[PDB]
Nucleic acid binder design. Structure first.
Lengths: 222, 215
RNA sequence: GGUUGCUCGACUGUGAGUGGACCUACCCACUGUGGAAACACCACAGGAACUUCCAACCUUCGGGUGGCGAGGUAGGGCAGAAGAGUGACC
């Protein structure tokens, strides 16, 4: 039951730039299915982009990318691709790879989606995050977290204790600093007893900048 | 020359167990080439209905598609909390394909006051010359709340940024984080930093607060 | 000279409602289904209906069997036939 779609080749690209998204298939052969690209700008809806139909290679493109994008498939590599040229701001989105199901089974429904890859068309140069700790105070549970400040582009991942701690944790949506950079903050609440003896580290990973930080969140020093 | 898929409502609050109905209306007849999708915040979409009334393999029988000419309706007989999601119609009757604009469905629970805390800026941060103060409202509902910063009993304005979690798929609650941001110098001009919370679950506006420098 | 056959035969026809169903091969289409299949390709089923016909087959002569893509090309088939011959008869 290995049916999987794994997009890649996204990232931060200067306007007018070019990217070629790749999408690798598992547990089935794309020679027998229609494959579609669908993109979602942040907090916006789904937008069909292109598709290539099996046995004939006939390609169809959403009209907003007609002539700048070129969907294509490599049989041999069980991969499908989307070359993108003359990228603009509004091409910014997560770009999803979808398999169109077998007709006898699921109609023209799209039955498997990738996790999708994120394309950030701007020219503002990357900058990694400066993570600061958020300590508990003196108030039977209290809260502690990390402040992940002034990074770009999205995304960062936060885990706690290398994902050992997972419960009670809230990681807030990045907002956009007036500086144009992203800031956000992850918090967990824990029982007031563990403070003395439980080391609490958040792990911050900002792959765009090749930045990974681990910040020990310890209580009020005084 | 595209089929317009015109979905509505744009959003939906409804109680658990309720019947909810989402309607997409195809600007042209698209036969039954309509599929519906569930999308929880930050996953991919998952297929629900194909061919406008066929329930895709594995989907809970509470969901169901329906067609009446050019008008398609998705229905949940009885909401679970899990069914917090954004729902999209699609037509693959003809290229270019087309989606609805989506419908954000929201759980509805009994009221929950926020748990409130306040965070005075880290000492590493202050060396770098910045000073951000964090106020945190945990696991509450309804999401509508009012946060107010006051510095030395002076209501601030425009220098905080808040952001809210998505409705908990289990609690169906919310969590907010208002963040006042000041230059280090502006922060060393005042003693008291307060975070005033006015929520429906609170019968009196909670204020966590701190004074600069206290240990 | 007729008159008629008999045989050969250039050439032409295969006529659509008050009236057109001849066969075959290729090409070219059109519709529906199915092929891991929205298009392309392949397979298969179809070309409104009521008629009309029998170029075809069987007949106990009562009838019955079978058969439509008004496409193109090419052979044929059946009809005429200009002409020839070639008889008989007057």
């Amino acid at each position: 039951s290995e049916v999987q779609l794994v997009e890649s080749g996204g990232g931060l690209v200067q306007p007018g730039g070019s990217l070629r998204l790749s999408c690798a298939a598992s547990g089935f052969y794309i020679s027998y299915s229609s494959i579609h690209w669908v993109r979602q700008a942040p907090g916006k809806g789904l937008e069909w982009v292109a598709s290539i139909s099996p046995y004939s290679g006939s390609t169809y493109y959403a009209d907003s990318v007609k002539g700048r994008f070129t969907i294509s498939a490599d049989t041999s590599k069980n991969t499908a691709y989307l070359q993108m040229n003359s990228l603009r701001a509004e091409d910014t989105a997560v770009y999803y790879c979808a398999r169109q199901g077998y007709r006898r089974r699921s109609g023209r429904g799209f039955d498997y989606w990738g996790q999708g890859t994120l394309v950030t068309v701007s020219s503002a140069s990357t900058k990694g995050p400066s993570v600061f700790p958020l300590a508990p105070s003196s108030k039977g549970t209290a809260a502690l977290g990390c402040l992940v400040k002034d990074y770009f582009p999205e995304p960062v991942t936060v885990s706690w204790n290398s994902g050992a701690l997972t419960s009670g944790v809230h990681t807030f949506p990045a907002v956009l600093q007036s500086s144009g950079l992203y800031s956000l903050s992850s918090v967990v609440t824990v029982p007031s007893s563990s403070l003395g003896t439980q080391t609490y580290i958040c792990n911050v990973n900002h792959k765009p900048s090749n930045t990974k930080v681990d910040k020990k969140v310890e209580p009020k020093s005084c | 020359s595209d089929i317009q898929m015109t979905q509505s409502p744009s959003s939906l609050s409804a109680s658990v167990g309720d019947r909810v109905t989402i309607t997409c209306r195809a600007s042209q007849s698209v036969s039954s080439a309509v599929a519906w999708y569930q999308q929880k915040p930050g996953k991919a979409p998952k297929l629900l209905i194909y061919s406008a009334s066929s329930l895709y393999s594995g989907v809970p029988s509470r969901f169901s598609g329906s067609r009446s000419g050019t008008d398609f309706t998705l229905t949940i007989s009885s909401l679970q909390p899990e069914d917090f999601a954004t729902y999209y119609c699609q037509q693959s009757y003809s290229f270019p394909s087309t989606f609805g604009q989506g419908t954000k469905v929201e759980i509805k629970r009994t009221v929950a006051a926020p748990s409130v805390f306040i965070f005075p800026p880290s000492d590493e941060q202050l060396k770098s010359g910045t000073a951000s103060v964090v106020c945190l409202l945990n696991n509450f509902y309804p999401r509508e709340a009012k946060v107010q910063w006051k510095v030395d009993n002076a209501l601030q304005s425009g220098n905080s940024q808040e952001s809210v979690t998505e409705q908990d798929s289990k609690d169906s609650t919310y969590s907010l984080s208002s963040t006042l941001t000041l230059s280090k110098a502006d922060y060393e001009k005042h003693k008291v930093y307060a975070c005033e919370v006015t929520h429906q679950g609170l019968s009196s506006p909670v204020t966590k607060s701190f004074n600069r420098g206290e240990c």
